[PDB]
């Protein structure tokens, strides 16, 4: 079970782990329990492995889609905030962290992808995916490109796949039907085809990853990128003149991002649960704790009503909420990990031209309803 009489936290590398570390600091200065903040690579993958052995962090932060699986494997402790503490948070955010009716984590923030554009190359962002090719044609003549975003993570591409009808698991009478998947239907096929055509026709490259896309927009070479709130910090730092807005429509329907609820879970294997709960509910989940974190890497829309209230007014935040509203909150069922790995292969194989769209989506469909 290990741990000690201290706190070890694991959070993804794209989040404000230094803001989080500033919050451990006044936990410790006010308590004697020192907090250690780490951001291992693949932590979402590494957790189940080391926690399974009874070790790992005291507290784990990830989007809520991974939590149903952790809970089913028994890796998380059931938390118990009272109705007063519960009351401070938006209720749709506690729903995201419920597995078989029990709460298995504290909801922190609401994440949705947005279109980010360079106001200096493109004062007015395109309203449609369909006018992007033309747009690229024009910029390219000027040594630039219309759009670049991470193609290696299915999370970035799902909004387009889902726009005209693709879907993960059908939500039917209080639950998700694991055998009803919409990764190979006509909307999903139209969406991926459109993407592959972008590449085919040299508007985009099959290899773009997170870093390539980020450096491109931050250096002024591409006019738009698609990313979450956590990327805003580096943009600010590069001083590009950027706007954040709704994603473009495809076939007249809104792009539909999967929405993630950034969440903090307590290792079932920790000796520190009480410490952990003090920290979360009394240090981090305050206006002050959230703001130390948000000044490091922006969180998006926060689940704490009080702070959220001050947060947006911010047009970046308003846009985040609008894309979120057109999207769908992810399922947290154990099957989310099969879905993601199947959809990850499919896109890469299709973008790389190793498989046709029809072949890629069909394999994915088969793999999932495995």
């Amino acid at each position: 079970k290990i741990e000690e009489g201290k706190l070890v936290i694991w959070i993804n590398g794209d989040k404000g782990y230094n803001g989080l570390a500033e919050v451990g600091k006044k936990f410790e200065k006010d308590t004697g329990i020192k907090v250690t903040v780490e951001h291992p690579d693949k932590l979402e993958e590494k957790f189940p492995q080391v926690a399974a052995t009874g070790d790992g962090p005291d507290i784990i932060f990830w989007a809520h889609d991974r939590f149903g699986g952790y809970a089913q494997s028994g890796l998380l402790a059931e938390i118990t905030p009272d109705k007063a503490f519960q009351d401070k948070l938006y209720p749709f955010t506690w729903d995201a962290v419920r597995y078989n009716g029990k709460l298995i984590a504290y909801p922190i923030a609401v994440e949705a992808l947005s279109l980010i554009y360079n106001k200096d190359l493109l004062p007015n962002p395109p309203k449609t995916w369909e006018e992007i090719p033309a747009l690229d044609k024009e910029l390219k003549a000027k040594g630039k490109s219309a759009l670049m975003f991470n193609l290696q993570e299915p999370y970035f591409t799902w909004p387009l796949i889902a726009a005209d009808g693709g879907y993960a698991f059908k939500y039917e009478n209080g639950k998700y039907d694991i055998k009803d998947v919409g990764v190979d239907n006509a909307g999903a096929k139209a969406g991926l085809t459109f993407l592959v055509d972008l590449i085919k026709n040299k508007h985009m490259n099959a290899d773009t990853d997170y870093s390539i896309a980020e450096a491109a927009f931050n250096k002024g070479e591409t006019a738009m990128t698609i990313n979450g709130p956590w990327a805003w910090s580096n943009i600010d730092t590069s001083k590009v003149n950027y706007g954040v807005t709704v994603l473009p429509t495809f076939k007249g329907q809104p792009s539909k991002p999967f929405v993630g609820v950034l969440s903090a879970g307590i290792n079932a294997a920790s000796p520190n649960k009480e410490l952990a709960k003090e920290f979360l509910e009394n240090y981090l989940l305050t206006d002050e704790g959230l703001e130390a974190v948000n000044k490091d890497k922006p969180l998006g829309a926060v689940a704490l009503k009080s702070y959220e209230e001050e947060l947006a007014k911010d047009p970046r935040i308003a846009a985040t909420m609008e894309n979120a509203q057109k999207g769908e909150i992810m399922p947290n069922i154990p099957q989310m990990s099969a879905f993601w790995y199947a959809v990850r292969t499919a896109v890469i194989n299709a973008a790389s031209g190793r498989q046709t769209v029809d072949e890629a989506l069909k394999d994915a469909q088969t793999r999932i309803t495995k």
Partner: protein, 466 residues
Amino acid sequence: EHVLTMLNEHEVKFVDLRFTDTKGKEQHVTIPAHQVNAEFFEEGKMFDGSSIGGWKGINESDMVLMPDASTAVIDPFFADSTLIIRCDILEPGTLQGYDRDPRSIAKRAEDYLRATGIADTVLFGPEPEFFLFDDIRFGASISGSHVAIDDIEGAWNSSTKYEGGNKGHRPGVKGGYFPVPPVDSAQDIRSEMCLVMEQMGLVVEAHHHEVATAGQNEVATRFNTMTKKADEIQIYKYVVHNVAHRFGKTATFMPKPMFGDNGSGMHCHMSLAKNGTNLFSGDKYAGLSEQALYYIGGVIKHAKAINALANPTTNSYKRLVPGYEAPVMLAYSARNRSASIRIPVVASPKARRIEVRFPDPAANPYLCFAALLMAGLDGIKNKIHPGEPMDKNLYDLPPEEAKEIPQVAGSLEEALNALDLDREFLKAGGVFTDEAIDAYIALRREEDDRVRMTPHPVEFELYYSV
């Protein structure tokens, strides 16, 4: 993954792998649930090809059983919890899809549909009928042959002495259409079949006693996309056969078990679609699109070849005989039930479709449906016009111009021969290979021979005193 959770949710002990042979008969093999792993889904399981009729020969026996995770459903009859998973038959290494695998062939045909861009999905609504008996006996040896049918509903039992008395409320010959119980003795059983069919994913629209005495019955199910429907037919038959068995009966999908009363048919309602719109609705005859008409023309042009798959038994032709209601005239109409192609008159254009009436339940789902499609497509690609609808009368009077208008094959051999010659429309898109077709024909010719070569009881009546 859905499968791996169904295994835990139902505490499954076994997995029953199913597939269909060329003749259309569902086959199976079972493995313990613990043999189901990640590998299983990506590479399937190996089995001997040479064992199934008309498949691999002397040298290339081994082949692959590829589980189709979308088909997972619990078996409602087996004693120990077991999950059924339909499989396709793939060539080893290449993992392509065996030329002779009827399910692969049907899938190929759905692919070719999308490819030609004519439509994106095919809709099949077959209506298989069947019989429920109490006793079925038959045999054939050098010194003779026979067949004896028996059921508590058989009109012939009006005179039979029964242990606890003859309660005598039976459907007379051709008198089974809807007398309420007790004349209809199969209400409870038809419903169990319905409930079970639905537990297995089918959607039931209705159930009723059919025309013939002695237990002809029918369970009507909702249409579905071509390949999924053929799967449903297999399940349908399975449920019918097994519920009957559990009730102390025995069911048969033979097309004509009795001379003198109704045979069992399997009408096939069809229509095409693209992006949710019904490509068969239009301003032409009875609410049809010109596409529908070309389709009909195709079916009519290749009828005799389709027969080899839709009426694959010599028995099939004992149903398709110059009778009044015999669906043997190759024509269409919205009324004339002499026409093998009826046009349902319905209000919503969303439900416009055609009904090809000559198929029987003995037909291989897959191959029958596929052949129907391919004929339809070839009717479209080549804008084969139907001609005008027949609204006059059937085969008898007419008899004016000797009434030699189009007709379905009159014997299995004739149908097989048509299939032989008229095979191009099936080879289109590489759906059917010559080898597959030739193998199928060979399997059926062997069957045709048994019947052609074995003296028939009636021949004694007719010629013993010659």
